[PDB]
Amino acid sequence: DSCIQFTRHASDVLLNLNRLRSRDILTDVVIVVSREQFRAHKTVLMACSGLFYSIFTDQLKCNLSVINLDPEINPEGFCILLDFMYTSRLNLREGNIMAVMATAMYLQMEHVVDTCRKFIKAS
Amino acid sequence: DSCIQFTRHASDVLLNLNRLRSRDILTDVVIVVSREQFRAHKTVLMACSGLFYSIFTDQLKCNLSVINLDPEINPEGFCILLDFMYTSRLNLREGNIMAVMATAMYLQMEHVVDTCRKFIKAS
């Protein structure tokens, strides 16, 4: 085509979606991880995770307001990944890298799994 | 913070949101422009437009499944802007620039209004 493109558009969209999340605006699901609850937008979860994409394209699960993750999933690992989904920023540290990689493998977030593998190989 | 960042994340998120729109997955509103109907995600509309942000933060309008735009709005101008919201690409042409600028002013899409003003000033 003969389109023009606005370089910062995608980043600005994601910043506004995170502002809606922080104010709890139009969130349509709660993700339960052990005792912890995380509110989010189904569309953002699907756009970032192969697991959520599979869950919310399912004709029965698409209508659920509550999703319980496997009890092996660490709430801190999930929180770091949910923050990444809405910001592109990953808080990867020596003390959380194993929990983050295991959660990213479960959520099917291929690019996060790749950087965790590389950082572990370096150490 | 000490975060790392994935450069292509925001663009990849927007690409997946457009894939959901094209397959009509989790769309929660229909925008009526004259006789034409456009299905979309409320969160994406709010993230891109000052007008939709105002509409869907309103305690009564947030629950509407149908929104009718002002009869002066051109369906082609709206279609081009909805495509921009989901892709960052604007199909700006000599034959549509006046309808696109008027629709962007109504939708309160400041960056689109700015490029339309600049392209009109050049001609």
């Binding site: 389109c3 023009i4 493109q5 606005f6 370089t7 | 690409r89 604007l90 490029t115």
Partner: peptide, 4 residues
Amino acid sequence: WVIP
């Protein structure tokens, strides 16, 4: 704005 750029030419993509």
